Amino acid sequence: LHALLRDIPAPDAEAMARTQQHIDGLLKPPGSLGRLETLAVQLAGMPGLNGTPQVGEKAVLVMCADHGVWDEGVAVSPKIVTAIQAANMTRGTTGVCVLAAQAGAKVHVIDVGIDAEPIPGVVNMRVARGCGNIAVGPAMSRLQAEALLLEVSRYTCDLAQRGVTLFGVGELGMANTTPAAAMVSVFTGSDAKEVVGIGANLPPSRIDNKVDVVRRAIAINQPNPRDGIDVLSKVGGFDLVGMTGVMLGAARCGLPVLLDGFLSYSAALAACQIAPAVRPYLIPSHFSAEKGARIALAHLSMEPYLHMAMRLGEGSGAALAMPIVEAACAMFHNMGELAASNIVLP
Amino acid sequence: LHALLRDIPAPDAEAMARTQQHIDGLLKPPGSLGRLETLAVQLAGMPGLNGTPQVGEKAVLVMCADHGVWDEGVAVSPKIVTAIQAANMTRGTTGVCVLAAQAGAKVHVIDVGIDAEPIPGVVNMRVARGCGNIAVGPAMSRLQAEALLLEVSRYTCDLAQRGVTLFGVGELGMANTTPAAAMVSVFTGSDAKEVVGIGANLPPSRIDNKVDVVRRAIAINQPNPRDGIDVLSKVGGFDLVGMTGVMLGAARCGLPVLLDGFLSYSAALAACQIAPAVRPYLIPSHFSAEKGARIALAHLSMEPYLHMAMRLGEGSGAALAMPIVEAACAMFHNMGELAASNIVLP
């Protein structure tokens, strides 16, 4: 793991300078394609993309797990919905499946801790049947968190061998917006009230209890904000650890990863804390309608491309943004050049 | 034309209620897909879509024309760039061509007033070789504006006969952000300084002159804010009139039209002034990086889906958003339902 983190490559400044020069000469006023230009240059710098913005195969990794904190009444969805939806992921009927299919991406469903019998068709990496209730103790041991990070990291970079060059990250886990809020509060130093949202339609009257649970989780566990693994193991969850793992693996592999919503922002804060070198590889997708989204994004210094008021999760936002990544590549490789049309601009 | 405007259909509330009921029953917490859900319902209500959100063929119509106000020094791009780029549109090397191809849409390039010899391959609907310099008089006569609106309107709804169900609108015309700003100022009652931007990289020192030209245009022509055709003919341009025409035609046809950037917002303000019934058919794409974008959008009560800091024009933003429209349709027709998985949520 220390080796893993140590070997994450820095972005290639040489390929990026070459990319910038090429974009400036395309058939348009310099800088007019804005964030599409910046995105193309960002991609050119990722070593796994071989010096040029390009997209080969695409995969969305959905980390599934249950949470003991569900018993504190912080979620209205029945606990079994995690297991049921994970099965639906194998049938192609969920939101991320439909949006991934539209983008030509494949969905990998990974069970890292569902509290139910194993589901055929789902990748089995389960740590336990649900994590510990963070309101009274830790979600898991540090050892468990580190081992899951490594296993998911390896699985992720292995896909790079099969032609995958663009990843999307997602989750499935009833009650997971509670540990997500705890993590965001700890990493950003923001009060729980400012980052606890309604998740999957929690009634406005049940919010107070959710905020209290988050504060108790932090008070009892005393997670160290400077140690991302300490934070994940104490007030996180297996799904959150798994998402962080996809990010470290894509980075080690020198490839881009598209974030999704609030849960993924929590995982990204942990990933960047653990290894700042991961940052250049993350690409935001949409601006989640979850209350703590603005704060988490400000700490990651990220501005999403899509404002869709989405809050489903599952990696649906990440899938929705894949066409945008392909568009930056299309602009780069297919547009004509000013000089060829004899156009000279100041 | 009066007939045209009179026959624009109202949205079908019955199809929309049926759409809403179906979306609420899909495999996700109610309302969790946010604006994707609202977009799907909006589409269900457009009569030309036959009661359901769907997308058949797609077309981006690019209106090209030159402006006499170019002589006032409000643009750094050579005048010939309009003609050169229009030709490039037929070769598939421009920004909108590349992005339209990525979205599976076809680009129709229409010459409504380029100051050059006719370009083979471009649809010829030219009114004149460039419009009048709005700084000293009107861009065109009311008769010319009305006739172009009708001709473009008919061309647009005719495409509906060929299977097109989704339109995108764009423009090509050096110096056109000047009449666009004049129109926005007149329709919104905002001062020219608040809506005049740098267009295609105008130097910061040349801005003052651009603002003065816009004020002179308004003072000399005295366009009536309550008469959109009066406004277009006096301080608009052939390209602006053409874009307004695509919007009236799509509306008459009961089909959706995706806006692009600032120029298209100007045209949409005119279209909605002329016939408020056009409003339900417009769909925003991106939030243009042009200075007056925020004001124009607030008056149209529109919130774009994409924040890409784009300012190229050509209909590039509209093309970039087509996948989002297809995504709302995919969600609607392909997602599974809660009842089939025996999931019951409060």
Question: Residue ranges of the domains in chain A?
Answer: 1-54+327-346, 55-326
Q: In what order do the strands lie in the sheet with A123-124?
A: A123-124, A106-113, A57-65, A164-172, A257-258, A282-283
Q: Is A311 in CB contact (< 8 Å) with chain B?
A: yes
Rg (alpha carbons) of chain B, rounded to whole number:
20
Nearest to B311 by CA among B182, B196, B198, B174: B198
DSSP, collapsed to helix, strand or coil, labels residue B272 as: helix
Q: Which of B37, B72, B290, B314 is catalytic?
A: B314
Helix then strand count (H, E) for chain B reads 13, 6
Measured CA to CA, the distance from residue B292 to residue B17 in angstroms comes to: 36
B171 labeled binding residue: yes
Contact at CB, A102 and B307, closer than 8 angstroms? no
Contact at CB, B289 and A335, closer than 8 angstroms? no
Question: Alpha helices of chain B — where are they, by DSSP H?
Answer: 2-6, 13-24, 34-44, 81-91, 95-102, 142-161, 177-188, 207-221, 228-235, 238-252, 262-274, 293-300, 316-334
Nearest to A292 by CA among A311, A273, A275, A272: A311
B249 labeled binding residue: no
Q: Is B200 in CB contact (< 8 Å) with chain A?
A: yes
Measured CA to CA, the distance from residue B242 to residue B111 in angstroms comes to: 9
Pairing of strands B164-172, B123-124: unpaired
Asked whether this chain's domains B1-54+327-346 and B55-326 adopt the same fold, the reply is no
Q: Is A78 in CB contact (< 8 Å) with chain B?
A: yes
Q: In the CATH scheme, what is the code of domain A1-54+327-346? A: 1.10.1610.10
DSSP, collapsed to helix, strand or coil, labels residue B254 as: coil
Q: Is A310 in CB contact (< 8 Å) with chain B?
A: yes
Quoted resolution (Å)? 1.9
Q: Measuring CA to CA, how many Å separate B191 from each of B121, B134, B289?
A: 41, 17, 19
- Measure in Å the smallest separation between the Cα of B23 and chain A Cα atoms: 12
Contact at CB, B331 and A98, closer than 8 angstroms? yes
CATH topology of domain A55-326: Rossmann fold (3.40.50)
CA angle A13, B99, A40 (to 5 degrees): 10
Q: Measuring CA to CA, how many Å separate A180 from each of A134, A271, B283?
A: 11, 13, 34
The DSSP call for residue A94 is: S
- Cβ contacts of A344 on chain B, cutoff 8 Å: 78
Q: In what order do the strands lie in the sheet with B164-172?
A: B123-124, B106-113, B57-65, B164-172, B257-258, B282-283
A43 labeled binding residue: no
For chain A positions 93-132, those within 8 Å of chain B (CB to CB) are 93-95, 98-99, 101-103
The DSSP call for residue B137 is: S
Q: Is A289 in CB contact (< 8 Å) with chain B?
A: yes
Q: Measuring CA to CA, how many Å separate B239 from each of A333, A337, B292?
A: 29, 25, 19
Measured CA to CA, the distance from residue A175 to residue A196 in angstroms comes to: 12
Q: Which residue has the tokens 């055709």?
A: B229
Measured CA to CA, the distance from residue B80 to residue B77 in angstroms comes to: 8
Measured CA to CA, the distance from residue A159 to residue A177 in angstroms comes to: 28
Q: HSE, CB side, 13 Å, CA atoms: give it for residue B209.
A: 13
C-alpha dihedral (B296, B299, B301, B304), degrees to nearest 10: 0
Contact A175, A70 (CB under 8 A): yes
Residue B22, both tokens: 């179906």
Q: Please provide the distance, in angstroms rounded to a whole number, between the alpha carbons at the two ends of chain A.
A: 51
Residue B208, both tokens: 């003052």
